[PDB]
Amino acid sequence: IPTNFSISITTEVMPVSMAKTSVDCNMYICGDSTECANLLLQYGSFCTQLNRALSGIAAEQDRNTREVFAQVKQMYKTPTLKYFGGFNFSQILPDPLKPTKRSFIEDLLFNKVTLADAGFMKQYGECLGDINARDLICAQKFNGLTVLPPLLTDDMIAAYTAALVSGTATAGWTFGAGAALQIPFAMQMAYRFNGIGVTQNVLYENQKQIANQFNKAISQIQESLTTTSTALGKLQDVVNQNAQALNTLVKQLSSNFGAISSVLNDILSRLDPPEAEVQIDRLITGRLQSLQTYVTQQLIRAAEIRASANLAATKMSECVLGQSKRVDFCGKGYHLMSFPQAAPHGVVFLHVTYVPSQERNFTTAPAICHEGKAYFPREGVFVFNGTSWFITQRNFFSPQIITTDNTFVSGNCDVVIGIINNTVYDPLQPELDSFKE
Amino acid sequence: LVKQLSSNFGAISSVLNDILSRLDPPEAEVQIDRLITGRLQSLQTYVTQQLIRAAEIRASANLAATKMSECVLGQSKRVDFCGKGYHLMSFPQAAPHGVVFLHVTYVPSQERNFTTAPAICHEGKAYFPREGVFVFNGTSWFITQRNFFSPQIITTDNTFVSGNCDVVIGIINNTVYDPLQPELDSFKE
Amino acid sequence: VLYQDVNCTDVSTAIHADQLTPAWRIYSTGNNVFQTQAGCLIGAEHVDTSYECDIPIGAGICASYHTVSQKSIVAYTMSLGADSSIAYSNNTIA
């Protein structure tokens, strides 16, 4: 039976969105040759079906992002105290004095994985900047590969994360059910511990210790996010896969598919138009095959990202919006709490798990026959017996005397293998003896 | 797929029986091979798209089967999985190439502000509440449930014994009731 | 019009000087709006209100069909959610 607990906080990073890419086949296929379009239009809707598929992928990514982040109805305002029952919620909620509207943990996450393969950003073409600061600048390239910005901006994602954290800390575990039942954080933690099986005694009598352990775990998470290693790299791997796909597409664009040269506007100045039409058709076929391979790989990656986003949304609905009895699903041990955090093209959950420690071996007993009838324990499943002494809980020691309220009546003693003779206590007989006599 | 069927892939025409009787058989074999290659590429693309769509539909069907096994065949304590709030029931319905469930969820009603009570020390020992943790109190009056009001008298059957009163922060001093003492005083005395 | 990726400055010049490839005969231009990945939404007024996202466009600027003075297409900030007044209290139970 463990005697002391150890509040730990684990991290879990799951991508929910990918790079919304859009490749224009008008510039990729038939870059600058005006005679190339006459042969390109001969094929058909190869430039329309791929654009439709890419638009569908973008819509699916936007819908997955909305289903993952946007789950609450009302936007709960972030509290100004950020200190509930001893639990210091700093570096989690947006600071009212910080210039940025994000959190410290959110800033540390956005300052690690947002490298985006520094040096390869000029492969595609986008429009970086914001409308507020008037720093929006559009950039294009001759390859025609473009990346569409996501629907939900980073500010909206940070606002959704702040609303989720506020609904988890304040209003208890009800903002996901459909109402807002305000309740202090102390009773919330009491219910969180009761859902596991531990009574409110360990929660209330050791509230300061739990708050100190929570603050220590938060500080350890901050120190791990400050200086880190190859860990926390799912989003980085997704970005690297997208960059490698774009680089392979660009390389296959400038590749000779069994023709005179891989560069346009050169075979027309050295060969006859009817003779160069064959080479143009071969180059167009090779480019179309490369683009079809790219579209298939993008479809596979989009299906994978959609599955990961559905899994992350399920985890957020089960761990954040309540207390799930799922074993090794939210964190490592008992869930007991959850806190979501924003991340670039992903979600980083903070599972405040419950890990017991300081175990000690003790003798037990299946049943206790007092006066011919056995007494199986009702609530406390562990019959902690030095020499047939007490009855305790499962996850915490909590030494408590054995009474008739913790055990029920049963049959004889010759039916249980391991019956131990002991006396059961009842507050009725001494009280009656003191009242009458 | 139909449009790519009636479409040229770099040949004389996209309709059969036309390129045959206009050139020599060896010259038409090249065009026939080009058309066959184009048709094979289009059909391979169609088969790949069908495989992707079949994988997606299989994933959705597995999710729907899990939802039916968890919500219809029993009562799952999942949060925001079957319906909006508490599942409490589920009814499946037939649909063309799909399943439409009818989750009879439980939604709360208008609320009311009350006063909290972490613990109650009657005679030096604190009495923490039972499974029902929301202790409704005007001024340290009663104890209630978590979802419905259900006003109930605070007795010894809804609380248990614990340590002293200086271990829990926010404990409100109040008196506890036990049905044994009045009955004994009425019977004996 | 929703021109995917442009500065919405050369497109207007190409339209006014007949330099764009898609040349609609019955087409005019009265007002252009520029946001992050705008699309040069010619026809909609950049209203400073906040309505529910009906037609998602991108970068948090959706479109819909509401009344202006009357029925016209507008642009808003998706109206992320209605504000709440749930305040924490260590002595209040709901």
XYZ file of C-alpha atoms in Angstrom:
720
model
C 0.000 0.000 0.000
C 1.590 3.342 -0.969
C 2.001 5.921 1.782
C 2.930 9.050 -0.210
C 1.891 10.411 -3.603
C 3.846 12.206 -6.323
C 1.950 14.657 -8.532
C 3.560 14.546 -11.982
C 2.774 16.401 -15.213
C 3.509 14.709 -18.544
C 3.425 16.164 -22.052
C 1.945 14.800 -25.276
C 2.322 16.446 -28.693
C -0.061 15.468 -31.493
C -0.280 17.177 -34.904
C -3.772 18.244 -35.953
C -2.963 20.219 -39.100
C -0.405 20.266 -41.900
C 0.836 22.692 -44.557
C -2.090 23.801 -46.739
C -0.290 23.563 -50.074
C -1.708 24.720 -53.410
C 0.204 24.035 -56.639
C -0.915 25.881 -59.772
C -0.475 23.646 -62.820
C -0.588 26.687 -65.120
C 2.936 27.678 -64.018
C 4.284 24.244 -63.054
C 3.184 22.699 -66.358
C 4.076 24.904 -69.350
C 6.030 27.519 -67.422
C 6.534 30.221 -70.056
C 6.131 28.550 -73.472
C 2.977 29.895 -75.118
C 2.899 26.975 -77.571
C 3.000 24.539 -74.636
C -0.523 25.476 -73.517
C -1.985 24.332 -76.847
C -0.727 20.809 -76.140
C -1.508 21.026 -72.415
C -5.189 21.775 -73.079
C -5.319 18.667 -75.294
C -5.168 16.349 -72.268
C -8.188 17.614 -70.338
C -9.043 18.331 -66.696
C -5.729 17.143 -65.238
C -5.194 20.714 -63.998
C -8.723 20.833 -62.517
C -8.998 17.488 -60.708
C -5.733 18.052 -58.832
C -6.791 21.567 -57.819
C -10.118 20.177 -56.596
C -8.288 17.511 -54.583
C -5.976 20.114 -53.038
C -8.944 22.334 -52.154
C -10.633 19.336 -50.547
C -7.480 18.598 -48.555
C -7.354 22.218 -47.377
C -11.029 22.129 -46.380
C -10.485 18.858 -44.505
C -7.516 20.349 -42.645
C -9.534 23.440 -41.708
C -12.439 21.279 -40.519
C -10.096 19.113 -38.438
C -8.525 22.210 -36.875
C -11.978 23.602 -36.063
C -13.184 20.311 -34.566
C -10.024 20.026 -32.456
C -9.739 23.579 -31.119
C -13.228 25.085 -31.426
C -15.274 22.900 -29.064
C -16.786 25.288 -26.486
C -19.768 27.569 -27.065
C -18.867 30.618 -24.951
C -15.445 32.247 -24.580
C -14.793 32.365 -20.839
C -12.702 35.358 -19.800
C -9.354 34.547 -18.228
C -9.240 35.250 -14.472
C -7.003 37.967 -13.062
C -5.951 36.179 -9.859
C -4.441 33.032 -11.450
C -3.933 31.610 -7.921
C -6.719 29.201 -6.928
C -6.364 27.302 -3.662
C -2.569 27.477 -3.768
C -2.179 26.231 -7.352
C -0.189 28.895 -9.210
C -1.607 29.031 -12.747
C 1.054 31.456 -13.994
C 2.692 30.965 -17.409
C -0.514 29.191 -18.524
C -3.021 32.051 -19.007
C -2.319 35.087 -21.216
C -0.646 37.766 -19.124
C -2.498 41.122 -19.179
C 0.823 43.017 -19.095
C 2.689 40.990 -21.723
C 2.625 42.583 -25.206
C 1.746 39.296 -26.908
C -1.650 37.701 -26.281
C -0.200 34.189 -25.880
C 1.051 32.268 -22.847
C 4.618 31.708 -21.679
C 4.380 27.984 -22.441
C 2.787 28.864 -25.784
C 5.663 31.241 -26.546
C 8.233 28.586 -25.616
C 6.463 26.123 -27.920
C 6.299 28.658 -30.770
C 10.010 29.471 -30.310
C 11.204 25.872 -30.825
C 9.359 24.196 -33.720
C 8.723 27.303 -35.861
C 12.141 27.002 -37.536
C 10.316 25.502 -40.551
C 13.626 24.358 -42.085
C 15.370 27.730 -42.081
C 16.787 28.204 -45.573
C 14.062 26.408 -47.572
C 11.178 28.859 -47.063
C 11.874 30.379 -50.496
C 10.950 27.095 -52.217
C 7.211 27.829 -52.230
C 5.423 31.181 -52.360
C 3.165 32.724 -49.724
C 2.000 36.104 -48.371
C 3.668 36.617 -44.995
C 2.705 39.415 -42.626
C -0.352 40.703 -40.809
C -3.050 43.194 -41.748
C -2.923 45.051 -38.414
C 0.739 46.107 -38.563
C 0.508 46.590 -42.368
C 3.479 44.227 -42.798
C 1.737 41.886 -45.250
C 3.953 41.103 -48.250
C 3.047 38.568 -50.936
C 5.818 36.424 -52.419
C 5.556 34.210 -55.501
C 7.863 31.935 -57.478
C 8.053 30.627 -61.032
C 7.447 27.024 -59.926
C 3.883 27.934 -58.927
C 3.990 26.092 -55.590
C 2.012 28.078 -53.010
C 1.056 27.516 -49.372
C -2.322 28.773 -48.192
C -2.537 30.240 -44.675
C -4.846 28.398 -42.266
C -8.329 29.618 -41.426
C -7.903 29.941 -37.652
C -5.142 32.445 -36.928
C -2.639 31.906 -34.119
C -4.452 34.550 -32.059
C -7.732 32.637 -32.356
C -5.964 29.400 -31.392
C -4.460 31.113 -28.343
C -7.888 32.484 -27.412
C -9.438 29.015 -27.694
C -6.636 27.579 -25.551
C -7.143 30.283 -22.917
C -10.892 29.618 -22.919
C -10.275 25.886 -22.475
C -7.859 26.496 -19.594
C -10.361 28.856 -17.952
C -13.189 26.339 -18.340
C -10.964 23.640 -16.855
C -9.784 25.710 -13.879
C -12.946 27.752 -13.303
C -16.550 26.532 -13.644
C -15.295 23.002 -12.876
C -15.842 20.059 -15.215
C -19.109 21.407 -16.637
C -18.202 23.731 -19.541
C -18.141 20.669 -21.812
C -21.482 19.294 -20.649
C -23.506 22.332 -21.731
C -23.603 24.619 -18.692
C -21.206 26.534 -16.415
C -21.358 25.377 -12.781
C -18.929 27.621 -10.910
C -17.061 25.825 -8.124
C -13.823 26.519 -6.201
C -10.728 24.647 -7.332
C -10.462 22.899 -3.952
C -13.754 21.028 -4.351
C -12.857 20.373 -7.995
C -9.636 18.640 -6.937
C -11.611 16.840 -4.222
C -13.920 15.383 -6.872
C -10.946 14.589 -9.125
C -9.384 12.561 -6.304
C -12.710 10.934 -5.384
C -13.179 9.752 -8.969
C -9.974 7.727 -8.674
C -10.930 6.136 -5.356
C -9.050 8.280 -2.843
C -11.235 10.124 -0.348
C -11.141 13.887 0.188
C -8.965 13.446 3.295
C -5.712 13.331 1.320
C -6.887 16.275 -0.797
C -7.921 18.653 1.988
C -5.455 17.656 4.723
C -2.544 17.834 2.241
C -3.648 20.682 -0.024
C -0.447 22.684 0.494
C 1.718 19.691 -0.431
C -0.313 19.044 -3.590
C -0.068 22.717 -4.568
C 3.698 22.704 -3.997
C 4.097 19.540 -6.079
C 1.982 21.060 -8.860
C 4.096 24.228 -8.858
C 7.284 22.143 -8.898
C 5.989 20.110 -11.844
C 5.067 23.309 -13.700
C 8.562 24.687 -13.070
C 10.117 21.433 -14.299
C 7.990 21.575 -17.459
C 9.103 25.174 -18.024
C 12.763 24.221 -17.565
C 12.357 21.281 -19.957
C 10.743 23.540 -22.567
C 13.506 26.143 -22.177
C 16.381 23.712 -22.827
C 15.326 20.576 -24.699
C 16.588 17.953 -27.151
C 15.384 15.871 -30.110
C 12.200 15.215 -28.113
C 9.030 17.184 -28.906
C 9.462 16.769 -32.658
C 6.223 15.496 -34.210
C 5.392 18.907 -35.683
C 9.018 19.261 -36.787
C 8.852 15.878 -38.533
C 5.617 16.883 -40.273
C 7.189 20.149 -41.458
C 10.286 18.263 -42.628
C 8.155 15.775 -44.573
C 6.260 18.629 -46.233
C 9.520 20.396 -47.110
C 10.992 17.184 -48.533
C 7.860 16.628 -50.627
C 8.071 20.179 -51.984
C 11.792 19.785 -52.716
C 11.213 16.491 -54.539
C 8.433 18.099 -56.585
C 10.704 21.019 -57.511
C 13.530 18.631 -58.419
C 11.241 16.512 -60.604
C 10.081 19.742 -62.260
C 13.634 20.378 -63.510
C 14.265 16.815 -64.670
C 14.649 15.432 -68.194
C 12.023 12.722 -68.764
C 13.780 11.254 -71.792
C 13.880 14.324 -74.034
C 16.388 16.796 -75.461
C 16.480 19.134 -72.455
C 14.596 19.679 -69.205
C 14.378 23.472 -69.698
C 11.687 25.013 -71.890
C 12.222 27.746 -74.507
C 15.297 25.828 -75.726
C 14.063 22.928 -77.869
C 11.945 25.320 -79.959
C 15.068 27.201 -81.114
C 16.940 24.071 -82.261
C 14.258 21.683 -83.587
C 11.255 21.886 -85.876
C 7.866 22.586 -84.233
C 6.391 19.218 -85.311
C 9.568 17.486 -84.116
C 9.621 19.462 -80.853
C 5.964 18.634 -80.146
C 7.001 15.079 -79.240
C 9.562 16.326 -76.716
C 7.036 18.805 -75.306
C 4.479 16.013 -74.884
C 7.070 13.803 -73.176
C 8.007 16.596 -70.760
C 4.333 17.312 -70.042
C 3.680 13.618 -69.379
C 6.642 13.413 -67.004
C 5.567 16.550 -65.147
C 1.999 15.240 -64.880
C 3.236 11.915 -63.498
C 5.395 13.720 -60.931
C 2.475 15.954 -59.936
C 0.160 12.939 -59.629
C 2.700 11.228 -57.368
C 2.899 14.412 -55.289
C -0.903 14.579 -55.058
C -1.095 10.936 -53.959
C 1.551 11.493 -51.278
C -0.319 14.611 -50.139
C -3.558 12.616 -49.923
C -1.841 9.961 -47.796
C -0.289 12.582 -45.513
C -3.641 14.369 -45.232
C -5.367 11.129 -44.231
C -2.675 10.541 -41.602
C -3.007 14.097 -40.265
C -6.800 13.730 -40.189
C -6.534 10.507 -38.182
C -4.108 12.175 -35.765
C -6.433 15.177 -35.445
C -9.419 12.935 -34.711
C -7.376 11.130 -32.054
C -6.314 14.457 -30.525
C -9.909 15.720 -30.524
C -11.051 12.529 -28.794
C -8.278 12.938 -26.213
C -9.294 16.559 -25.619
C -12.967 15.626 -25.258
C -12.195 12.789 -22.831
C -9.352 14.209 -20.711
C -9.947 17.977 -20.727
C -13.760 18.116 -20.744
C -13.981 15.720 -17.797
C -12.383 12.844 -15.908
C -12.064 9.601 -17.876
C -11.267 6.251 -16.259
C -9.245 5.239 -19.332
C -6.044 3.414 -18.375
C -2.858 4.835 -19.940
C -4.795 6.992 -22.417
C -4.488 10.607 -21.251
C -1.155 10.437 -19.426
C 0.782 7.657 -17.694
C -1.054 6.837 -14.465
C -4.347 8.241 -13.220
C -5.521 11.182 -15.327
C -6.944 13.348 -12.512
C -6.629 16.550 -14.608
C -5.717 17.853 -18.059
C -4.595 21.164 -19.562
C -4.390 21.837 -23.316
C -1.820 24.187 -24.818
C -1.573 25.744 -28.265
C 1.131 24.679 -30.714
C 1.966 25.367 -34.380
C -0.126 22.906 -36.423
C -0.677 20.727 -33.365
C -1.827 20.492 -29.765
C 0.310 19.929 -26.659
C -1.626 18.518 -23.706
C -0.489 18.740 -20.077
C -1.735 15.690 -18.157
C -1.353 16.179 -14.392
C -1.055 12.481 -13.604
C -1.172 10.801 -10.190
C 1.758 8.524 -9.332
C 1.897 6.831 -5.905
C 5.186 5.987 -4.219
C 6.747 4.786 -0.949
C 5.251 1.297 -0.958
C 5.420 -0.987 2.075
C 4.452 -4.644 2.396
C 1.787 -5.626 4.925
C -0.211 -8.727 5.802
C -3.854 -8.952 4.730
C -6.953 -11.098 5.243
C -9.776 -11.957 2.806
C -12.550 -12.022 5.427
C -13.076 -11.673 9.179
C -15.403 -13.969 11.147
C -16.400 -12.265 14.400
C -19.237 -14.413 15.803
C -19.644 -17.110 13.155
C -20.472 -14.796 10.236
C -17.861 -13.198 8.001
C -17.520 -9.471 7.270
C -16.201 -8.584 3.827
C -15.008 -4.972 3.456
C -17.486 -2.684 1.718
C -15.528 0.446 0.753
C -11.890 -0.097 1.717
C -10.759 -2.990 -0.458
C -7.357 -3.435 1.247
C -7.657 -5.079 4.679
C -4.396 -3.776 6.131
C -3.698 -6.180 9.006
C -0.599 -5.975 11.143
C -2.209 -8.704 13.227
C -5.875 -8.388 12.155
C -5.916 -4.696 13.023
C -7.563 -2.326 10.522
C -9.006 -1.841 7.030
C -7.552 0.682 4.585
C -7.890 2.057 1.048
C -6.336 0.948 -2.251
C -4.224 3.921 -3.396
C -3.469 5.557 -0.023
C -2.742 4.273 3.475
C -5.404 6.255 5.392
C -5.333 4.219 8.642
C -8.935 3.751 9.769
C -10.472 1.458 12.373
C -12.719 -1.410 11.280
C -16.404 -0.851 12.082
C -19.764 -2.255 10.994
C -20.190 0.585 8.478
C -17.219 -0.595 6.380
C -18.236 -4.283 6.303
C -21.443 -6.147 5.478
C -22.939 -9.447 6.608
C -22.202 -12.677 4.741
C -22.302 -16.441 5.247
C -20.171 -18.717 7.419
C -16.378 -18.992 7.727
C -15.924 -22.367 5.981
C -16.523 -20.876 2.516
C -13.618 -18.382 2.278
C -10.072 -19.723 1.917
C -7.948 -17.745 4.365
C -10.437 -16.698 7.033
C -8.813 -14.874 9.960
C -10.467 -14.702 13.377
C -10.818 -11.128 14.637
C -13.287 -8.887 16.472
C -15.316 -6.192 14.713
C -16.186 -2.892 16.388
C -19.578 -1.185 16.532
C -20.329 2.249 18.058
C -23.788 1.095 19.201
C -22.972 -1.274 22.074
C -20.591 1.001 24.064
C -22.931 3.953 23.517
C -25.908 1.971 24.825
C -23.873 0.701 27.785
C -22.833 4.263 28.645
C -26.385 5.592 28.240
C -28.162 2.906 30.279
C -25.423 2.037 32.782
C -13.122 8.580 -65.009
C -15.673 8.813 -67.832
C -14.223 12.127 -69.032
C -10.691 10.702 -69.007
C -12.056 7.716 -70.944
C -13.252 9.935 -73.815
C -10.089 12.035 -73.855
C -6.922 11.918 -75.935
C -3.517 11.159 -74.403
C -1.256 12.495 -77.138
C -2.549 10.708 -80.232
C -4.481 11.408 -83.429
C -7.931 11.081 -81.845
C -9.654 9.770 -78.723
C -12.280 7.657 -80.542
C -11.575 4.093 -81.637
C -12.164 2.810 -85.190
C -10.926 6.187 -86.507
C -7.129 5.912 -86.233
C -7.314 2.399 -87.703
C -8.506 3.142 -91.250
C -6.409 6.260 -91.822
C -2.772 5.051 -91.659
C -0.734 1.864 -91.763
C -1.187 -0.845 -89.097
C 2.413 -0.367 -87.875
C 1.836 3.392 -87.724
C -1.475 2.923 -85.889
C 0.049 0.511 -83.355
C 1.972 3.407 -81.787
C -1.215 5.443 -81.356
C -3.035 2.400 -79.958
C -0.227 1.844 -77.444
C -0.310 5.513 -76.421
C -4.082 5.371 -75.907
C -3.780 2.139 -73.910
C -1.066 3.676 -71.722
C -3.228 6.736 -71.080
C -6.247 4.599 -70.203
C -4.116 2.467 -67.873
C -2.755 5.561 -66.120
C -6.260 6.991 -65.689
C -7.580 3.673 -64.356
C -4.630 3.356 -61.959
C -5.322 6.860 -60.644
C -8.990 5.926 -60.220
C -8.040 2.729 -58.373
C -5.700 4.638 -56.051
C -8.409 7.200 -55.275
C -10.868 4.358 -54.650
C -8.380 2.705 -52.283
C -7.964 5.960 -50.346
C -11.731 6.474 -50.150
C -12.215 2.851 -49.071
C -9.651 3.271 -46.291
C -11.436 6.431 -45.134
C -14.831 4.696 -45.212
C -13.394 1.719 -43.310
C -12.023 4.036 -40.620
C -15.390 5.800 -40.362
C -17.186 2.443 -40.172
C -14.875 1.247 -37.395
C -15.540 4.486 -35.506
C -19.300 4.054 -35.967
C -19.131 0.428 -34.814
C -17.193 1.480 -31.711
C -19.777 4.192 -31.021
C -22.611 1.679 -31.409
C -20.890 -0.833 -29.124
C -20.206 1.802 -26.452
C -23.407 3.897 -26.566
C -26.149 1.568 -27.838
C -25.085 -1.752 -26.285
C -24.623 -0.168 -22.857
C -23.908 2.967 -20.846
C -20.465 4.513 -21.343
C -18.994 7.146 -19.020
C -17.231 8.812 -21.961
C -17.256 12.614 -22.110
C -18.610 14.221 -25.304
C -18.296 10.930 -27.206
C -21.852 9.646 -27.689
C -23.773 12.918 -27.441
C -23.238 16.425 -26.072
C -23.421 15.867 -22.313
C -24.264 12.658 -20.468
C -25.045 9.800 -22.859
C -27.781 8.142 -20.761
C -29.280 6.383 -23.825
C -28.764 5.738 -27.530
C -31.015 4.665 -30.410
C -29.607 3.660 -33.820
C -31.436 4.318 -37.074
C -30.994 2.895 -40.555
C -29.562 5.167 -43.246
C -28.346 4.683 -46.836
C -24.656 3.717 -46.609
C -24.464 5.058 -43.064
C -25.844 4.992 -39.537
C -27.748 7.791 -37.785
C -27.741 7.570 -33.992
C -30.208 9.214 -31.600
C -28.308 10.084 -28.415
C -30.840 10.997 -25.704
C -28.446 13.238 -23.813
C -28.923 14.883 -20.413
C -28.624 18.682 -20.314
C -28.785 20.642 -17.020
C -31.089 23.594 -16.336
C -31.023 27.067 -14.767
C -28.515 27.408 -11.935
C -28.428 29.172 -8.568
C -25.619 30.543 -6.411
C -24.966 28.899 -3.043
C -22.244 28.737 -0.381
C -19.519 26.093 -0.285
C -18.531 23.904 2.664
C -15.223 21.986 2.526
C -15.686 20.398 5.961
C -17.814 20.582 9.110
C -16.400 20.181 12.631
C -19.148 19.243 15.089
C -17.198 18.309 18.245
C -13.602 18.724 17.093
C -13.719 16.128 14.295
C -14.352 17.135 10.689
C -17.110 15.428 8.692
C -16.226 15.356 5.005
C -19.167 14.675 2.669
C -19.879 11.405 0.884
C -20.080 10.769 -2.894
C -22.272 13.854 -3.150
C -19.626 16.554 -2.803
C -21.676 19.727 -3.434
C -22.718 20.794 0.075
C -25.521 23.295 -0.478
C -25.740 25.690 2.471
C -27.609 28.920 2.997
C -25.727 29.334 6.279
C -24.330 25.840 6.994
C -27.733 24.192 6.590
C -27.865 21.044 4.433
C -25.983 18.852 1.952
C -27.059 18.019 -1.592
C -26.122 16.143 -4.772
C -24.016 17.294 -7.737
C -26.488 17.420 -10.658
C -29.963 17.817 -9.126
C -30.859 19.950 -6.118
C -32.467 17.206 -3.977
C -32.407 18.997 -0.585
C -31.506 16.491 2.131
C -30.888 16.778 5.864
C -27.228 16.602 6.888
C -26.878 13.393 8.923
C -24.077 11.057 9.986
C -24.936 8.666 7.132
C -23.741 11.212 4.537
C -20.390 11.960 6.221
C -17.492 10.092 7.816
C -15.004 10.712 10.615
C -11.680 12.450 9.988
C -8.972 14.345 11.861
C -8.993 17.763 13.520
C -10.317 21.093 12.210
C -6.974 22.884 11.686
C -5.967 20.710 8.711
C -8.536 21.855 6.099
C -8.574 25.473 4.916
C -12.031 27.028 4.784
C -13.849 24.712 7.201
C -17.144 26.137 8.486
C -18.203 25.354 12.047
C -21.595 23.631 12.115
C -23.491 20.910 13.981
C -24.193 17.410 12.688
C -27.331 15.355 13.322
C -27.681 11.654 14.123
C -31.048 9.831 14.293
C -29.862 7.663 17.206
C -29.715 10.204 20.043
C -33.276 11.635 19.758
C -34.786 8.157 19.414
C -32.827 6.894 22.425
C -33.799 9.930 24.510
C -37.457 9.463 23.551
C -37.456 5.718 24.280
C -35.342 5.537 27.450
C -36.326 8.916 28.912
C -13.722 37.342 -57.062
C -11.237 35.404 -54.927
C -7.870 35.661 -56.703
C -5.836 33.206 -54.664
C -2.424 34.816 -54.048
C -1.922 38.396 -55.285
C -1.228 41.858 -53.871
C -4.634 43.142 -55.108
C -2.759 46.065 -56.703
C -1.560 44.675 -60.041
C -4.845 42.809 -60.555
C -6.816 46.066 -60.459
C -4.445 47.615 -63.004
C -4.708 44.550 -65.252
C -8.510 44.722 -65.074
C -8.578 48.467 -65.785
C -6.104 48.048 -68.677
C -7.245 44.641 -70.037
C -4.181 42.606 -69.076
C -5.825 39.712 -67.187
C -6.560 36.450 -68.988
C -10.087 35.843 -67.566
C -11.956 38.802 -69.081
C -15.613 38.750 -68.070
C -17.678 40.997 -70.335
C -20.265 41.986 -67.703
C -17.996 42.779 -64.759
C -17.170 45.898 -62.740
C -15.113 46.920 -59.707
C -16.227 49.313 -56.986
C -14.307 48.418 -53.830
C -11.377 46.170 -52.918
C -10.540 44.739 -49.491
C -7.048 43.650 -48.427
C -6.412 41.273 -45.515
C -4.056 38.357 -44.936
C -4.709 36.159 -47.980
C -7.501 38.517 -48.981
C -8.397 37.409 -52.493
C -9.350 40.950 -53.583
C -12.941 40.476 -52.448
C -14.485 42.877 -54.958
C -18.142 43.273 -54.009
C -18.014 42.947 -50.222
C -17.631 45.724 -47.650
C -15.154 45.273 -44.785
C -17.637 45.664 -41.942
C -16.146 46.007 -38.454
C -18.815 43.773 -36.880
C -18.469 40.121 -35.800
C -20.837 37.535 -37.289
C -20.740 33.748 -37.350
C -18.475 32.293 -40.035
C -20.838 31.172 -42.809
C -18.487 30.990 -45.814
C -14.913 30.275 -44.655
C -12.297 32.066 -46.768
C -9.032 32.037 -44.817
C -6.915 33.744 -42.155
C -9.979 34.286 -39.966
C -12.042 36.420 -42.376
C -15.229 34.674 -43.502
C -18.063 35.995 -45.663
C -21.853 35.871 -45.474
C -24.998 37.544 -46.856
C -26.381 40.039 -44.326
C -28.112 43.430 -44.464
C -26.020 46.602 -44.763
C -28.543 49.401 -45.346
C -29.693 46.413 -48.100
C -28.700 42.777 -48.615
C -25.000 42.525 -49.463
C -21.960 40.346 -48.833
C -19.840 41.373 -45.841
C -16.615 40.334 -44.086
C -16.116 39.809 -40.346
C -13.787 38.209 -37.779
C -15.740 34.910 -37.517
C -17.217 35.963 -34.137
C -15.068 33.460 -32.225
C -17.617 33.234 -29.423
C -19.989 35.147 -27.205
C -18.415 36.665 -24.107
C -19.193 35.170 -20.700
C -19.242 36.472 -17.128
C -18.225 33.335 -15.211
C -16.111 34.751 -12.371
C -14.210 32.595 -9.899
C -15.326 32.610 -6.268
C -14.128 30.514 -3.327
C -17.557 30.735 -1.645
C -20.032 30.286 -4.534
C -21.604 27.008 -5.679
C -23.785 26.582 -8.780
